[PDB]
Design a protein around this ligand. Structure first.
Ligand SMILES: N#Cc1ccccc1C[C@@H](N)C(=O)N[C@H](Cc1ccc(Cl)cc1Cl)C(=O)N[C@H](CC(=O)NCCCc1ccncc1)Cc1ccc(F)cc1
Ligand SMILES: N#Cc1ccccc1C[C@@H](N)C(=O)N[C@H](Cc1ccc(Cl)cc1Cl)C(=O)N[C@H](CC(=O)NCCCc1ccncc1)Cc1ccc(F)cc1
Ligand SMILES: [Cl-]
Ligand SMILES: [Cl-]
Lengths: 304, 304
């Protein structure tokens, strides 16, 4: 029993974290085999940051300008390239702790674990969703750029996020591991605004199913709604439209609990219209949207 | 910026998790040097669980009755003993991945990270507080007994919790790594009730300071309260008495934010009496008490 925001065990990623330094600028890098991946703005000075031409700044760099530190031992750089907004440094040593891994680019509404690091050294791990406006609501201080987000599937590490910047609003923006930003953002020090955010409807519904699996039923009701009548209410409360694909993704949870998806949508409608009136769901006094249906299945019992 | 429930990186503990089997009963063990630690009820059958005499059951065991599995390789047991409610199995191989570690017994209100494991294999990590009634509100399924809770201090792993059982109310009870239960509980399959729980006042105050460090101030007010007048309100809302030691522990946070502790207590009083009226603090619609002052300092910026 119980339900908590649960991160993946971080050990496989811990063995990959290193430190990359260019001038007086240090951030974190990811060491897989004989390549170190880090944000390309490590090659910028505080001057260059306002509007850099990275192709210009990189052609003025040599290999020995990059200091890569894996714990105590320096790694010698033997080659460097640029792939979108990530720098790739070839080094003369393969990481012996390299896990099975892949790089994947995720969709908004999907979750991952963040290993927050400072000077190449892990400090903590937490769970995040990619918001619909392509930011994450992270916990990051100066020095954390280069930290990665990841999922784990049967000892294969799927890296999906590299941290590049905090926006003026205090939320966080970054790229996949091939350097492509999530959302419209660019890697320069200018005030950039994210689009207006929305609530991830399919995830709220998954979390209501988690609550039922855990024995909490107070929010259920005898009613059902049509998908279209639900979305009219969803739109009014700044919730994402629910699609037939979302309905089908919630199939397993519906089947384990005997509550039809559109049945659960009528509960969500009533909760949006009337609030909770002082009650809590899984220890929360608001509707939580950072658990995917996969997250719920992974953590909850297969029997209600 | 940002504030999230943050676990310690779990890699150092991942390398210690093993599987212990006695009869048809399997749970998790902790492998440090040449000793495996696990809950002693692994030697019980479903019959024995109602009211076991463990000294009786253990003297009827031999070393070869214990199957210890570290990944794929079996570890050969060469000796076994009992220390309170933990079994200790000597094995013929020292764990090469043994970190620097110690065993510590914590106070209620302190937090730790849980590495949830099944069949010796880590599945996830989350943060927990030891409740005032000595339970934890964990997330555990069948098979998780043997999972450990821990803090990390400068690459030294301080193990503080081993998981032994879920109570009929769905909360969780266990021991320190020397086998002493937290709270009044015993390791037998009977319905056991925990004392009535209370809210950890010093932690709520720490979390209000986290909110101020992160730029949220809406709950402050111009008033102060005396420690005794605060506790009269605390008692009315089932909050723990606040001690002068708690006041002094919150010294650093008070100093970083310029808000006197008793000033913050007047904010807490007003929040208890009037609620939040639809507003949130650090993304929460209730007052959160599972962050210690140490947790706040560790995660938040040293500058407001
Ligand atoms: N994580 C993180 C982090 C956090 C603090 C310091 C440092 C770092 C990492 C570090 N690497 C990094 O992100 N620095 C970028 C500058 C930058 C570097 C490189 C690149 Cl490519 C782009 C950018 Cl923008 C950074 O300083 N951002 C500022 C962070 C900041 O002051 N927030 C205040 C939050 C206000 C608030 C909080 C809560 N509620 C409401 C409001 C915001 C900002 C300021 C000017 C600007 F013009 C663009 C952005
Ligand atoms: N974690 C965990 C876990 C969770 C589920 C299954 C198995 C395990 C691990 C496993 N190892 C283990 O804990 N089994 C013990 C039995 C036991 C083994 C060994 C020892 Cl030493 C002591 C005890 Cl008590 C266990 O089955 N408990 C029950 C778990 C349970 O049904 N909860 C229902 C929750 C109801 C609820 C939920 C939410 N909101 C309100 C109410 C509760 C219980 C039942 C009878 C009894 F008499 C004592 C306790
Ligand atoms: Cl794809
Ligand atoms: Cl002590």
């Amino acid at each position: 029993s119980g339900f908590r925001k649960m991160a993946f065990p971080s050990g496989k990623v811990e063995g990959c974290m290193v430190q990359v330094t260019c001038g007086t600028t240090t951030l974190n890098g990811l060491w897989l085999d004989d390549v170190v991946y880090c944000p390309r703005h490590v090659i910028c000075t505080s001057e260059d940051m306002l509007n850099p031409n990275y192709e210009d700044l990189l052609i003025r760099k040599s290999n020995h300008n990059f200091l890569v530190q894996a714990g105590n031992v320096q790694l010698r750089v033997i080659g460097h390239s640029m792939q979108n907004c990530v720098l790739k440094l070839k080094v003369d040593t393969a990481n012996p702790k390299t896990p099975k891994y892949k790089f994947v680019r995720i969709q908004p509404g999907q979750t991952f674990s963040v290993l927050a690091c400072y000077n190449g050294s892990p400090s903590g791990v937490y769970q995040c969703a990619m918001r619909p406006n392509f930011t994450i609501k992270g916990s990051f201080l100066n020095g954390s750029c280069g930290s990665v987000g990841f999922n784990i599937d049967y000892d294969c590490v799927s890296f999906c996020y590299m941290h590049h910047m905090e926006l003026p609003t205090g939320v966080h923006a970054g790229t996949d591991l091939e350097g492509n930003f999530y959302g419209p953002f660019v890697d320069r020090q200018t005030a950039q605004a994210a689009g207006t955010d929305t609530t991830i409807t399919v995830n709220v519904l998954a979390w209501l199913y988690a609550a039922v699996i855990n024995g909490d039923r107070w929010f259920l009701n005898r009613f059902t709604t049509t998908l279209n009548d639900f979305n009219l209410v969803a739109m009014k409360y700044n919730y994402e439209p629910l699609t037939q694909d979302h309905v089908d993704i919630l199939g397993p949870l519906s089947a384990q609990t005997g509550i039809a998806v559109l049945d659960m949508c009528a509960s969500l409608k009533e909760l949006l219209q009337n609030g909770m009136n002082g009650r809590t769901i899984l220890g929360s006094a608001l509707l939580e949207d950072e658990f995917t249906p996969f997250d719920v299945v992974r953590q909850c019992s297969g029997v209600t």
